[PDB]
């Protein structure tokens, strides 16, 4: 929440500081370093806010961030693996359904009275 | 321990589960007269991982020499002074899951002549 | 777990900045500007990857539900294989004797 | 929908090459998320020596 | 002249370089503390102990406080730069692991321990690390922060100070008094690691670590040193059938088998002594301890 | 690459086989290796002093007396630190020096 | 101390100490004159013997302060502190660092080295001072703690004459039955030891020999002489030679003890007023 906007303002101040210290400056460019230290202090306040927030994140998010993609791709892949497991399990249960139907067909062919009493009892 | 040439050691369970990969393990079953705890294959199993470590730490390394898939699996005992330096100590051959020590061309002949004469 | 990583990132950033400020008067100032902008690139990369994290913090709970789904379906697959396994252990071990 | 949305539209506002991977960055500081750094010292206040060190040219 | 910034430390910061004087390489320490209180306790106890103990302990297997100054608030301690450390060396994937070399490392560590025990000053906290290897490879012991003297007068002896993994069994109980036992059991766990290649007993926190030590050596016998439960804090641990040393590290030469059995012996009284261990015939054997000229070096 | 690289030059000559066909191709054997480096720094006597002397185990009147300010005590004895360690430290330290 | 370390810091004979104290007095005098705050040889500058007398009376007061510490204190810690204090003024002058700051600091550093693990409330409770004034002193204590080690050459271990005493008495309970139940000997020896500690004995003589001489003086005072014990030590190297050295050291120790006396308070207050005025004089260091 607020940690995002705070660290974003910190990163933009860091970029402006890199731009200013990249350029020769008559004005006291120590204000850039002071704003960087104040951003570190506000990040400590945001770390208190992160103790308030208590986010738990898996490591593969960190690793896909290392690959430089969206973590949204990790969300799509977790959703895709969920649907892959659900597809496989529904397919196994569907083959068991077809096999049970075939078995009761063939046993009703070969044993009439017994499968009749079974279809009665169910 | 009287005469290592005159000892044979075996075990039925390991017999059906025997393959080129497991021959060293069968020699390693422990309580086997031919092999010893001092061998470094033991220090490797105690530690972790078996790779080019026999070329790194050089010493007593029992290694398979020649292998026939069903039964024949010959093992050689080497003493390394350094990498790329091998000194052969002895040879133990396993026939039908039965381990024997390869007789010297000369100790065998001496005993043989003695019995005949 | 992201709170601990946030605190550790802020600590490592402040400590590396302290080392940079310590060597700042020490380093030759013209190339020290280059070292400063290199360090600024380091901090920007740390902070943008933390920004990616706090972006994904909205999408955390759906991945938690996906982990629940995946565990459940893996459990049912192990149930199928266990049923077939116990039937094989019936048909080849207990009935032969 | 397309899920190859760049690491931009995601991290878009920050300047610099945000998309660039950690291996390409070659930064010791970046290697930190994978293994957490130890909090050896608490954050300290800014000092005059730092400003004297910088001050540009 | 500070020339390098190896990094910060647990209660210190280190820089590697040549001093105001000679060009020789040395590691320079800068004092680290929480000075925020307007009532600071001045310097920390760990620092005070470490500096004087290192200065006094001068041995080919002990590092020493050489030069020492402190014009500013800063206090500077001078210790010789070393190559690396045994711990990371054996921690890394087998680059060239070797027992004739493991035995040489053990010999240097034991000679250092004998000198420290003779000087009448226990090394309170040998941990796997905190042991340093130099370029020649002579290994001298280093971290001395937690050490204390051990003597006849009764005094509050510090407790639970040692790390859980290397805590002595008597310390794990909750014992108010102690002896060379802590250092001996700990060298013992470091040897264990060199042979096994991974840490011997893993304890997440006090009780779990005590349980795992007991599982590794079995329940201590009643004959061992009865009063093992009569020390101040004891909990009957699981009645393990017990495993021979042969079980945990599967094998090696039996002389090594004997040193291990001996450092381990449970009665603190019988834990083998430094002189006793050197005198063990294992050191004087056909396998030769490495001179250190051929000692293994990684990167 | 025909010149600087092997370019199958080693393919032309293989000398039948000396690894699979037969391991009796060794013939040219050699050794004569030496090192002469064993049993180094076994000796543990580094004893130093500028003082008189005292033995490690007491088994004497001092052990028989077994008396300190508080003598010895049982519960802490588990702690180890048998008074033995005690008198040894005490005497050794006292004897240390005596003649600058 | 076969443990070396103090082998370097064992000044050998009376004159060297006298000379060193004198030289530091000169050093401060000169630095100040050169700075040129004052014309040379003004009234304020002190004299070394007067400085030593002020130091001894104030040190007896410091020993009383160590004794009245609310938590029980091992004799080792008190001794460590006194030694540290004497050795500190062998390098500098009384004026450069006021004796009160030095005494309190030696005490805290000493406690930290000797592992007494003092509680912070216990230390503040013992001092009879206003909390604000005690905190002002504590701020100085911090800076002067680092300053102490700098001028102490970082040599912190101090050999305390106790351990040897317990040890010789155990040897007494075992090797010689000629004397018996030597505990009267124990208290008298303690009395001789405090008087020995007030002298430069710690600096000159070996501490083990100091304990042996205290035991010998106690024995002579009560009716026993240890020729036979001296004879067991003669059962050793140097053949006859060891005994003459032991006797000479014992005689010199007896002479210093008989000559040493507490400085009179009337004289001490005059000196105090002078020194107070002295530190109230303008030093000021640097910008």
Short mmCIF file of C-alpha atoms in Angstrom, two decimals, chain C residues 11 15-16 19, chain D residues 37-42, chain E residues 5-15 28-34 44 46-47 50 77 79 127 129-130 143:
data_model
loop_
_atom_site.label_atom_id
_atom_site.label_comp_id
_atom_site.label_asym_id
_atom_site.label_seq_id
_atom_site.Cartn_x
_atom_site.Cartn_y
_atom_site.Cartn_z
CA UNK C 11 19.92 -2.13 6.34
CA UNK C 15 25.38 0.30 5.35
CA UNK C 16 26.67 0.40 1.77
CA UNK C 19 30.76 2.85 3.34
CA UNK D 37 21.91 -9.63 4.44
CA UNK D 38 22.62 -9.42 8.23
CA UNK D 39 21.52 -6.27 10.15
CA UNK D 40 25.05 -5.68 11.58
CA UNK D 41 24.38 -1.97 12.37
CA UNK D 42 21.21 0.17 12.81
CA UNK E 5 36.80 -2.70 3.03
CA UNK E 6 36.34 -6.39 3.73
CA UNK E 7 33.11 -5.56 5.53
CA UNK E 8 31.30 -5.08 8.82
CA UNK E 9 31.43 -7.62 11.73
CA UNK E 10 29.26 -8.84 14.68
CA UNK E 11 30.51 -6.04 17.00
CA UNK E 12 33.22 -4.58 14.73
CA UNK E 13 34.15 -3.43 11.19
CA UNK E 14 37.28 -4.55 9.29
CA UNK E 15 39.50 -2.94 6.67
CA UNK E 28 42.73 -3.38 10.77
CA UNK E 29 39.75 -3.47 13.18
CA UNK E 30 37.55 -0.52 14.07
CA UNK E 31 35.53 -0.59 17.34
CA UNK E 32 31.73 -1.08 16.91
CA UNK E 33 29.09 -0.44 19.67
CA UNK E 34 25.64 1.04 20.38
CA UNK E 44 32.12 -3.85 25.45
CA UNK E 46 33.87 -9.02 24.46
CA UNK E 47 36.24 -6.34 23.05
CA UNK E 50 39.57 -10.30 23.11
CA UNK E 77 43.29 -3.36 16.82
CA UNK E 79 45.69 -8.56 13.52
CA UNK E 127 32.67 -22.34 16.55
CA UNK E 129 34.27 -20.74 11.81
CA UNK E 130 36.13 -18.33 13.99
CA UNK E 143 37.72 -15.17 17.71
#
